[PDB]
Amino acid sequence: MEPVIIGALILDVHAKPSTTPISGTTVPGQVLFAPGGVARNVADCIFKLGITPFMIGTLGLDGPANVLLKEWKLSMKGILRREDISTPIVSLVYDTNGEVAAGVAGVDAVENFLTPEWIQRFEYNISSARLLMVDANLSSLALEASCKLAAESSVPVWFEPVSVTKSQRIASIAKYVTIVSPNQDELIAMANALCAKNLFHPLSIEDMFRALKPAILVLLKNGVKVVIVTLGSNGALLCSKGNPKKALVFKRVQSVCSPNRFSERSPSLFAMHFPTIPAKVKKLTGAGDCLVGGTVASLSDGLDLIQSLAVGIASAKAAVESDDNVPPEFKLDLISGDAELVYNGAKMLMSML
């Protein structure tokens, strides 16, 4: 009952300049190819954590596809390859921060060729899936087809907003979505999209949460059960409608991250903050994807959402310390240790909605 991952397979071009990038000319630095795309990264992360995912995507019969598939050890029956299709490419120019200064995509092969027609071939896989994860690179039509299959079989759906623009695609599928994982810009865009108007616009944790609470409520009322807001270096917010456990390799995590840790019996809005762990950043790209991958893998292994999120945040830290979007391997003892640190450090927010 493998988790099913649907979305983009992208060849990433990462340009980290030695000095500050200046207009009108090139500056010295390093430029690397990295296997990318939210869905590909999530699948890769889940696999390296010891769970086999099923990948549904589309690739070309070109050079970039041959880079992405060189060391691909998962099934490829879910991957649509034809010659008319041009493999998606994202080109990023970083700053010295490790943040993106300028990026271009690059990815309309996904919206045009990862169709409902292709996804419906795998109705059994989605139906029997432990979890369905879709990224917003999919078209509204593909997202509808995907999410309606999982809902039919009562399979929980994870929607990754990918960007501010593409996050608005939550609008037509919100009912079917169980979990979303936006940052604070994407959360705002999603809230605006469901509100049909531009009602929301993009410090301490209780300030940030109080500022995002109206936007979070919008998503919850539109049928989303769990909203995970990634706050980068100040961790993540886990917000859910009802008890977070009721909303939906790792027996180490189950041991040390006790499910009996949190005494709190079913609120309309549940909120708690997860801290992140200090890390030696080489590239922040892929951090969010590994959070999702780490979380899905744990949920797929029978852990609850609170335990799974800690694993996700652990995986995110490992990812920023690599020059890949997803690290070449995961060290389980490191993953478990970091997860416990995050888990034990998780605190609850907020007595009347």
Does 235 count as an annotated binding residue? yes
Kindly give, in sequence order, each residue whose CB lies less than 8 Å from that of residue 349, ignoring residues fewer than 6 positions away. 205, 206, 209, 237, 271, 272, 273
Task: Rank residues 234 and 243 by Cβ distance to a second copy and give the closer one.
Answer: 234
Give how far the C-alpha of residue 62 lies from the chain's centroid of Cα atoms, to the nearest Å.
27
Does 166 count as an annotated binding residue? yes
Query: What is the smallest separation between the CB atom of 349 and Na ion, expressed in angstroms?
Result: 29
15 binds, among a second copy, Na ion, none (CB under 5 to 8 A by kind): a second copy
Does 295 count as an annotated binding residue? no
Task: Rank residues 166 and 225 by Cβ distance to a second copy and give the closer one.
Answer: 166
| CA angle, residues 132, 174, 140, in degrees to nearest 5 | 75
Kindly give, in sequence order, each residue whose CB lies less than 8 Å from that of residue 261, ignoring residues fewer than 6 positions away. 343, 344
Query: What is the smallest separation between the CB atom of 99 and a second copy, expressed in angstroms?
Result: 6
Q: Residue 196, Cβ neighbours under 10 Å: how many?
A: 8
Q: Where are the alpha helices (DSSP H) in 153-266?
A: 184-195, 205-221, 244-247, 251-256
Does 37 count as an annotated binding residue? yes
Which residue, among 112, 78, 104, 82, has the nearest Cα to 12 in the 3D structure? 104
Respond yes or no on whether the N-terminal peptide bond of residue 345 is cis (omega within 30° of 0). no
Which residues in this chain contact a second copy in the complex, by CB under 8 A? 11, 13, 15-17, 21-33, 62-64, 66-67, 70, 86, 89-93, 99-106, 108, 163-165, 185
222 binds, among Na ion, a second copy, none (CB under 5 to 8 A by kind): none
Which residues in this chain contact Na ion in the complex, by CB under 5 A? 283, 285-286, 319, 322-323
117 binds, among a second copy, Na ion, none (CB under 5 to 8 A by kind): none
Does 44 count as an annotated binding residue? no
Task: Rank residues 119 and 136 by Cβ distance to a second copy and give the closer one.
Answer: 136
Kindly give, in sequence order, each residue whose CB lies less than 8 Å from that of residue 223, ignoring residues fewer than 6 positions away. 174, 175, 176, 177
Query: What is the smallest separation between the CB atom of 41 and Na ion, expressed in angstroms?
Result: 10
Annotated binding site: 12, 26, 37-41, 137, 166, 181, 230, 232, 235, 276, 284, 288-289
